[PDB]
Design a protein that fits this description.
Elements: H1 6-39, H2 45-82, H3 95-125
């Protein structure tokens, strides 16, 4: 029993940072589809395959993100069970890294709502 180390704290920060980056790339791919459909009619499997790959990566991110949240829950509970209490010493992610993760979680739902809206638009339009 003890507290998190610096090589783990940077691993996890860097993990959060990579998710932010993946979300931002997905957003740019969704914006590109949105702009395509503003440019005119593009019916067919071409854009459905890309929508499907985007949902794919979004669902992967849902897991990566739920894992981090639940891993924090494992650390908190194990620490209590070991006689070391809580605080952010027992936690690889501190109150600040946990706050980013709330915004990342929220952005994960925004992106899903958006790719669905886009899918349903193309579905109607076609």
């Amino acid at each position: 029993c003890g507290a998190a180390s610096m090589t783990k704290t940077v691993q996890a920060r860097q993990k959060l940072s990579g998710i932010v980056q993946k979300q931002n790339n997905l957003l740019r791919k969704i914006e590109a589809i949105q702009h395509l459909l503003q440019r005119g009619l593009i019916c067919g499997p071409q854009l459905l395959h890309q929508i499907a790959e985007i949902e794919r990566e979004l669902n992967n991110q849902e897991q990566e993100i739920g894992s981090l949240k639940q891993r924090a829950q494992v650390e908190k509970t194990m620490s209590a069970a070991s006689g070391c209490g809580m605080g952010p010493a027992s936690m690889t992610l501190d109150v600040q890294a946990r706050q980013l993760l709330s915004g990342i979680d929220q952005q994960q739902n925004n992106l899903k709502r958006a790719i669905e809206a886009i899918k349903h638009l193309l579905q109607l339009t076609c």
